[PDB]
Ligand binder design. Structure first.
Ligand SMILES: CCCCNC(=O)[C@H](C)C[C@H](O)[C@@H](N)C[C@H](Cc1ccc(OC)c(OCCCOC)c1)C(C)C
Length: 333
Protein backbone atom coordinates (compact mmCIF):
# COMPACT_ATOMS: atom_id res chain seq x y z
CA UNK A 1 0.00 0.00 0.00
CA UNK A 2 1.01 3.53 0.81
CA UNK A 3 0.82 4.83 4.15
CA UNK A 4 3.48 5.36 6.36
CA UNK A 5 3.24 6.15 10.04
CA UNK A 6 5.01 7.11 13.17
CA UNK A 7 4.33 7.44 16.60
CA UNK A 8 6.37 10.09 18.46
CA UNK A 9 7.89 8.98 21.84
CA UNK A 10 8.84 10.61 24.95
CA UNK A 11 12.31 9.93 26.45
CA UNK A 12 12.58 9.59 30.21
CA UNK A 13 15.92 9.62 31.57
CA UNK A 14 17.03 7.72 28.77
CA UNK A 15 15.66 4.86 30.58
CA UNK A 16 12.06 4.81 29.57
CA UNK A 17 10.70 5.70 26.06
CA UNK A 18 6.90 5.71 25.59
CA UNK A 19 4.41 6.85 23.00
CA UNK A 20 0.60 7.03 23.00
CA UNK A 21 -2.21 4.96 21.66
CA UNK A 22 -5.95 5.27 22.05
CA UNK A 23 -8.24 2.32 22.98
CA UNK A 24 -11.95 2.61 22.67
CA UNK A 25 -14.53 4.60 21.11
CA UNK A 26 -14.27 7.49 22.67
CA UNK A 27 -10.64 7.03 23.00
CA UNK A 28 -9.02 6.38 26.38
CA UNK A 29 -5.57 7.55 26.16
CA UNK A 30 -2.73 5.60 27.44
CA UNK A 31 0.99 5.90 27.34
CA UNK A 32 2.97 2.94 26.28
CA UNK A 33 6.45 1.34 25.57
CA UNK A 34 6.61 -0.16 22.09
CA UNK A 35 8.42 -3.35 22.94
CA UNK A 36 9.86 -5.79 20.47
CA UNK A 37 10.63 -8.07 23.31
CA UNK A 38 7.07 -9.31 23.58
CA UNK A 39 4.02 -9.82 21.74
CA UNK A 40 0.93 -8.80 23.67
CA UNK A 41 -0.89 -5.49 24.36
CA UNK A 42 -2.09 -4.63 27.92
CA UNK A 43 -3.14 -1.49 29.74
CA UNK A 44 -4.44 -1.23 33.32
CA UNK A 45 -8.03 -1.83 34.21
CA UNK A 46 -10.47 -0.05 35.92
CA UNK A 47 -11.28 -3.35 37.40
CA UNK A 48 -7.85 -3.39 39.07
CA UNK A 49 -8.00 -3.01 42.78
CA UNK A 50 -6.37 0.19 44.00
CA UNK A 51 -4.97 -1.72 46.84
CA UNK A 52 -2.26 -2.07 44.19
CA UNK A 53 -0.62 1.24 44.35
CA UNK A 54 0.37 1.14 40.80
CA UNK A 55 -3.26 1.32 39.77
CA UNK A 56 -3.84 4.39 41.69
CA UNK A 57 -1.13 5.99 39.76
CA UNK A 58 -1.83 4.99 36.19
CA UNK A 59 -4.82 5.62 33.91
CA UNK A 60 -7.22 2.72 33.67
CA UNK A 61 -9.43 1.33 31.15
CA UNK A 62 -13.05 1.55 31.72
CA UNK A 63 -14.77 -0.33 29.25
CA UNK A 64 -18.22 0.46 30.08
CA UNK A 65 -17.64 3.76 28.70
CA UNK A 66 -16.69 2.38 25.49
CA UNK A 67 -19.15 1.93 22.80
CA UNK A 68 -16.82 -0.56 20.83
CA UNK A 69 -15.51 -2.88 23.51
CA UNK A 70 -16.09 -6.28 23.32
CA UNK A 71 -16.09 -8.87 25.94
CA UNK A 72 -13.61 -11.69 26.19
CA UNK A 73 -12.68 -12.96 29.49
CA UNK A 74 -9.76 -15.30 29.44
CA UNK A 75 -7.11 -14.73 32.04
CA UNK A 76 -3.76 -14.17 30.96
CA UNK A 77 -0.63 -13.65 33.01
CA UNK A 78 2.38 -11.87 31.54
CA UNK A 79 5.87 -12.69 32.76
CA UNK A 80 8.77 -10.51 32.00
CA UNK A 81 12.51 -10.17 32.62
CA UNK A 82 11.51 -8.10 35.38
CA UNK A 83 7.81 -8.23 36.68
CA UNK A 84 4.44 -9.99 36.12
CA UNK A 85 1.20 -8.38 35.57
CA UNK A 86 -1.92 -10.49 35.46
CA UNK A 87 -5.39 -9.72 34.03
CA UNK A 88 -7.93 -10.66 31.31
CA UNK A 89 -8.63 -10.32 27.72
CA UNK A 90 -10.73 -7.90 25.83
CA UNK A 91 -11.34 -6.10 22.52
CA UNK A 92 -11.83 -2.74 21.35
CA UNK A 93 -10.27 -0.63 18.62
CA UNK A 94 -6.84 0.69 19.24
CA UNK A 95 -5.39 3.58 17.32
CA UNK A 96 -1.57 3.67 16.87
CA UNK A 97 -0.44 6.82 15.02
CA UNK A 98 -3.37 7.38 12.89
CA UNK A 99 -3.92 3.62 11.96
CA UNK A 100 -6.85 2.10 13.65
CA UNK A 101 -7.11 -1.60 14.25
CA UNK A 102 -9.44 -3.69 16.55
CA UNK A 103 -7.12 -5.60 18.74
CA UNK A 104 -7.43 -8.07 21.59
CA UNK A 105 -5.62 -6.80 24.59
CA UNK A 106 -5.30 -7.31 28.21
CA UNK A 107 -6.87 -5.32 30.93
CA UNK A 108 -4.49 -5.91 33.90
CA UNK A 109 -6.01 -6.03 37.32
CA UNK A 110 -2.84 -7.10 39.03
CA UNK A 111 0.00 -4.80 38.73
CA UNK A 112 2.76 -5.12 41.16
CA UNK A 113 4.35 -2.00 42.52
CA UNK A 114 7.78 -2.77 41.98
CA UNK A 115 8.54 -2.13 39.22
CA UNK A 116 5.29 -0.75 38.17
CA UNK A 117 5.16 2.20 40.53
CA UNK A 118 8.28 3.42 38.93
CA UNK A 119 7.15 3.30 35.38
CA UNK A 120 6.15 6.39 33.61
CA UNK A 121 4.24 4.52 31.14
CA UNK A 122 0.79 2.83 31.53
CA UNK A 123 1.20 -0.41 29.56
CA UNK A 124 2.91 -2.20 26.83
CA UNK A 125 2.54 -2.75 23.00
CA UNK A 126 4.42 -5.87 21.97
CA UNK A 127 5.83 -5.63 18.54
CA UNK A 128 6.97 -9.28 18.73
CA UNK A 129 5.76 -12.32 16.73
CA UNK A 130 2.61 -14.58 17.17
CA UNK A 131 4.80 -17.04 18.37
CA UNK A 132 5.69 -15.33 21.66
CA UNK A 133 2.17 -14.14 22.29
CA UNK A 134 0.83 -15.47 25.33
CA UNK A 135 -2.74 -16.59 24.75
CA UNK A 136 -1.88 -17.10 21.15
CA UNK A 137 -3.49 -13.69 20.50
CA UNK A 138 -2.74 -11.87 17.21
CA UNK A 139 -0.56 -8.84 17.72
CA UNK A 140 -0.91 -5.36 16.52
CA UNK A 141 1.55 -5.63 13.85
CA UNK A 142 0.03 -8.52 12.30
CA UNK A 143 -3.28 -6.96 12.35
CA UNK A 144 -2.09 -3.68 10.95
CA UNK A 145 -0.45 -5.51 8.33
CA UNK A 146 -3.72 -7.12 7.46
CA UNK A 147 -5.35 -3.81 6.77
CA UNK A 148 -3.30 -3.56 3.61
CA UNK A 149 -2.08 -0.03 4.06
CA UNK A 150 1.61 0.12 4.73
CA UNK A 151 3.93 0.41 2.07
CA UNK A 152 6.16 -2.05 3.75
CA UNK A 153 6.18 -4.57 6.31
CA UNK A 154 8.55 -2.80 8.35
CA UNK A 155 8.76 -0.76 11.52
CA UNK A 156 11.81 1.30 12.70
CA UNK A 157 12.85 2.98 16.05
CA UNK A 158 14.80 6.19 16.67
CA UNK A 159 15.68 6.71 20.42
CA UNK A 160 17.25 10.08 21.16
CA UNK A 161 19.54 11.24 23.64
CA UNK A 162 18.09 13.47 26.11
CA UNK A 163 16.78 17.11 26.94
CA UNK A 164 12.80 18.45 20.80
CA UNK A 165 11.94 14.70 19.75
CA UNK A 166 12.38 11.90 22.34
CA UNK A 167 12.16 9.25 19.80
CA UNK A 168 10.04 8.02 16.89
CA UNK A 169 8.69 4.78 15.33
CA UNK A 170 7.69 4.53 11.91
CA UNK A 171 5.41 1.93 10.70
CA UNK A 172 5.59 0.93 7.12
CA UNK A 173 9.25 2.39 6.69
CA UNK A 174 12.34 4.38 8.09
CA UNK A 175 12.99 8.05 8.37
CA UNK A 176 16.19 8.77 6.45
CA UNK A 177 16.58 11.92 8.40
CA UNK A 178 17.77 10.07 11.48
CA UNK A 179 20.34 7.67 10.08
CA UNK A 180 23.37 7.71 7.95
CA UNK A 181 25.53 5.66 6.00
CA UNK A 182 23.97 2.39 5.04
CA UNK A 183 21.73 0.04 6.81
CA UNK A 184 23.21 -3.26 7.55
CA UNK A 185 21.02 -6.27 8.14
CA UNK A 186 21.35 -9.35 10.26
CA UNK A 187 19.01 -12.20 9.37
CA UNK A 188 16.75 -13.54 12.05
CA UNK A 189 18.29 -16.67 13.61
CA UNK A 190 14.99 -18.86 14.20
CA UNK A 191 11.63 -16.94 13.37
CA UNK A 192 8.68 -15.94 15.51
CA UNK A 193 11.50 -13.91 17.59
CA UNK A 194 13.82 -10.74 17.20
CA UNK A 195 16.92 -12.76 18.08
CA UNK A 196 20.07 -12.37 16.11
CA UNK A 197 23.34 -14.15 16.03
CA UNK A 198 25.95 -12.45 17.96
CA UNK A 199 29.73 -13.14 17.15
CA UNK A 200 31.71 -11.84 20.22
CA UNK A 201 32.03 -8.95 22.69
CA UNK A 202 35.27 -6.97 22.82
CA UNK A 203 35.97 -4.93 25.81
CA UNK A 204 38.69 -2.52 25.00
CA UNK A 205 40.59 -4.37 22.47
CA UNK A 206 39.96 -8.19 23.02
CA UNK A 207 37.06 -10.71 22.92
CA UNK A 208 36.71 -11.15 26.45
CA UNK A 209 33.42 -12.82 25.87
CA UNK A 210 30.81 -14.00 23.48
CA UNK A 211 33.68 -15.78 21.80
CA UNK A 212 31.95 -18.93 20.26
CA UNK A 213 28.88 -17.03 18.98
CA UNK A 214 25.90 -15.98 21.05
CA UNK A 215 22.31 -14.62 21.00
CA UNK A 216 21.42 -11.01 21.12
CA UNK A 217 17.83 -10.25 21.34
CA UNK A 218 17.28 -6.66 20.01
CA UNK A 219 14.60 -5.21 22.39
CA UNK A 220 13.19 -1.76 22.32
CA UNK A 221 11.33 -2.23 25.51
CA UNK A 222 14.52 -2.61 27.52
CA UNK A 223 16.61 0.15 28.70
CA UNK A 224 19.98 -1.15 29.20
CA UNK A 225 22.25 -3.51 27.32
CA UNK A 226 22.42 -6.75 29.31
CA UNK A 227 23.72 -10.13 29.46
CA UNK A 228 23.82 -13.26 31.58
CA UNK A 229 24.99 -12.79 35.06
CA UNK A 230 27.89 -14.69 34.17
CA UNK A 231 29.36 -12.84 31.34
CA UNK A 232 28.05 -9.61 32.87
CA UNK A 233 30.02 -10.26 35.90
CA UNK A 234 33.15 -10.81 33.79
CA UNK A 235 32.78 -7.88 31.55
CA UNK A 236 32.24 -5.89 34.74
CA UNK A 237 35.46 -7.25 36.22
CA UNK A 238 37.28 -5.98 33.27
CA UNK A 239 35.90 -2.45 33.24
CA UNK A 240 36.52 -2.42 36.89
CA UNK A 241 32.90 -1.70 38.29
CA UNK A 242 31.07 -2.73 41.60
CA UNK A 243 27.59 -4.17 42.37
CA UNK A 244 25.08 -1.77 44.18
CA UNK A 245 22.29 -4.60 44.10
CA UNK A 246 21.07 -3.89 40.79
CA UNK A 247 23.56 -1.99 38.72
CA UNK A 248 27.26 -1.77 38.37
CA UNK A 249 28.99 1.51 38.78
CA UNK A 250 32.22 3.11 38.61
CA UNK A 251 33.72 5.99 40.23
CA UNK A 252 33.15 9.07 38.41
CA UNK A 253 36.62 10.31 37.93
CA UNK A 254 37.36 6.88 36.21
CA UNK A 255 34.40 7.46 34.10
CA UNK A 256 35.49 9.03 30.80
CA UNK A 257 38.13 6.39 30.41
CA UNK A 258 36.57 2.94 30.54
CA UNK A 259 37.43 1.38 27.23
CA UNK A 260 34.99 0.88 24.35
CA UNK A 261 32.83 -2.25 24.04
CA UNK A 262 32.10 -3.79 20.78
CA UNK A 263 29.41 -6.00 19.45
CA UNK A 264 30.13 -8.21 16.60
CA UNK A 265 27.10 -8.55 14.43
CA UNK A 266 27.29 -9.56 10.66
CA UNK A 267 30.92 -8.63 9.88
CA UNK A 268 30.34 -5.24 11.29
CA UNK A 269 31.30 -4.02 14.69
CA UNK A 270 29.06 -1.94 16.81
CA UNK A 271 31.21 0.00 19.18
CA UNK A 272 30.06 1.86 22.12
CA UNK A 273 32.33 4.53 23.40
CA UNK A 274 32.51 4.92 27.04
CA UNK A 275 30.17 7.86 27.05
CA UNK A 276 27.55 5.91 25.31
CA UNK A 277 27.42 3.59 28.36
CA UNK A 278 28.09 5.34 31.42
CA UNK A 279 25.64 7.74 32.91
CA UNK A 280 28.09 10.49 33.69
CA UNK A 281 26.41 13.02 36.10
CA UNK A 282 29.77 13.96 37.65
CA UNK A 283 33.45 13.55 37.19
CA UNK A 284 34.27 13.38 40.77
CA UNK A 285 36.62 10.98 42.63
CA UNK A 286 33.84 11.00 45.36
CA UNK A 287 30.57 9.83 43.74
CA UNK A 288 29.30 6.82 41.93
CA UNK A 289 28.20 6.65 38.33
CA UNK A 290 26.28 3.83 37.12
CA UNK A 291 26.55 2.01 33.76
CA UNK A 292 23.94 1.23 31.19
CA UNK A 293 24.65 -2.44 30.99
CA UNK A 294 23.11 -5.05 33.29
CA UNK A 295 22.70 -8.62 34.20
CA UNK A 296 19.46 -10.26 33.23
CA UNK A 297 18.89 -13.89 32.93
CA UNK A 298 16.15 -14.59 30.30
CA UNK A 299 15.22 -18.28 30.37
CA UNK A 300 15.20 -20.78 27.69
CA UNK A 301 12.19 -19.65 26.22
CA UNK A 302 14.39 -17.45 24.39
CA UNK A 303 17.18 -16.62 26.63
CA UNK A 304 19.90 -17.07 27.68
CA UNK A 305 20.44 -14.10 25.49
CA UNK A 306 21.95 -10.76 25.53
CA UNK A 307 19.47 -8.17 25.17
CA UNK A 308 20.38 -5.02 23.22
CA UNK A 309 18.08 -2.29 24.67
CA UNK A 310 17.90 1.43 24.49
CA UNK A 311 21.70 1.84 25.09
CA UNK A 312 22.24 0.41 21.82
CA UNK A 313 19.31 1.61 19.71
CA UNK A 314 20.10 5.04 20.56
CA UNK A 315 23.30 4.91 18.69
CA UNK A 316 22.04 2.72 15.87
CA UNK A 317 18.77 3.54 14.32
CA UNK A 318 17.00 0.12 14.13
CA UNK A 319 14.64 -1.16 11.44
CA UNK A 320 12.87 -4.36 12.04
CA UNK A 321 12.09 -6.30 8.71
CA UNK A 322 9.03 -8.37 8.47
CA UNK A 323 9.00 -8.76 4.83
CA UNK A 324 12.26 -10.35 5.11
CA UNK A 325 12.83 -11.40 8.54
CA UNK A 326 15.99 -9.76 9.43
CA UNK A 327 17.07 -6.62 11.36
CA UNK A 328 19.09 -3.79 9.89
CA UNK A 329 21.43 -1.31 11.73
CA UNK A 330 22.52 2.17 10.54
CA UNK A 331 24.08 5.06 12.37
CA UNK A 332 21.79 7.39 14.25
CA UNK A 333 21.99 11.06 13.54
C1 LIG B 1 5.98 -12.69 27.87
C2 LIG B 1 7.48 -12.90 27.55
C3 LIG B 1 8.31 -11.64 27.86
C4 LIG B 1 9.39 -11.47 26.88
N1 LIG B 1 10.24 -10.30 26.99
C5 LIG B 1 10.98 -10.05 28.05
O1 LIG B 1 10.96 -10.77 29.06
C6 LIG B 1 11.93 -8.83 27.94
C7 LIG B 1 13.43 -9.41 28.00
C8 LIG B 1 11.72 -7.79 29.03
C9 LIG B 1 10.43 -7.05 28.69
O2 LIG B 1 10.45 -6.69 27.28
C10 LIG B 1 10.23 -5.81 29.59
N2 LIG B 1 11.27 -4.82 29.29
C11 LIG B 1 8.84 -5.19 29.32
C12 LIG B 1 8.53 -4.15 30.39
C13 LIG B 1 9.08 -4.64 31.73
C14 LIG B 1 9.38 -3.42 32.58
C15 LIG B 1 8.98 -3.32 33.92
C16 LIG B 1 9.27 -2.16 34.66
C17 LIG B 1 9.95 -1.10 34.07
O3 LIG B 1 10.24 0.08 34.82
C18 LIG B 1 10.99 0.07 36.08
C19 LIG B 1 10.33 -1.19 32.73
O4 LIG B 1 11.05 -0.12 32.09
C20 LIG B 1 10.95 -0.24 30.68
C21 LIG B 1 11.55 0.97 29.99
C22 LIG B 1 11.30 0.86 28.47
O5 LIG B 1 11.39 2.16 27.91
C23 LIG B 1 11.75 2.00 26.56
C24 LIG B 1 10.05 -2.36 31.98
C25 LIG B 1 7.02 -3.91 30.55
C26 LIG B 1 6.60 -3.44 29.33
C27 LIG B 1 6.36 -5.21 30.91
Amino acid sequence: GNTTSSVILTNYMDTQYYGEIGIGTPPQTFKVVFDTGSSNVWVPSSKCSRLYTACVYHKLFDASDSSSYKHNGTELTLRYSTGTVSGFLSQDIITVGGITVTQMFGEVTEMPALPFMLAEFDGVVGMGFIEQAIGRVTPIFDNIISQGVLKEDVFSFYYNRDSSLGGQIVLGGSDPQHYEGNFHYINLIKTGVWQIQMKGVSVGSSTLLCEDGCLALVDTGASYISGSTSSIEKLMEALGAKKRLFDYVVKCNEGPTLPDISFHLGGKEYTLTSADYVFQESYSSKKLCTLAIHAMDIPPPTGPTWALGATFIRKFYTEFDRRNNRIGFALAR
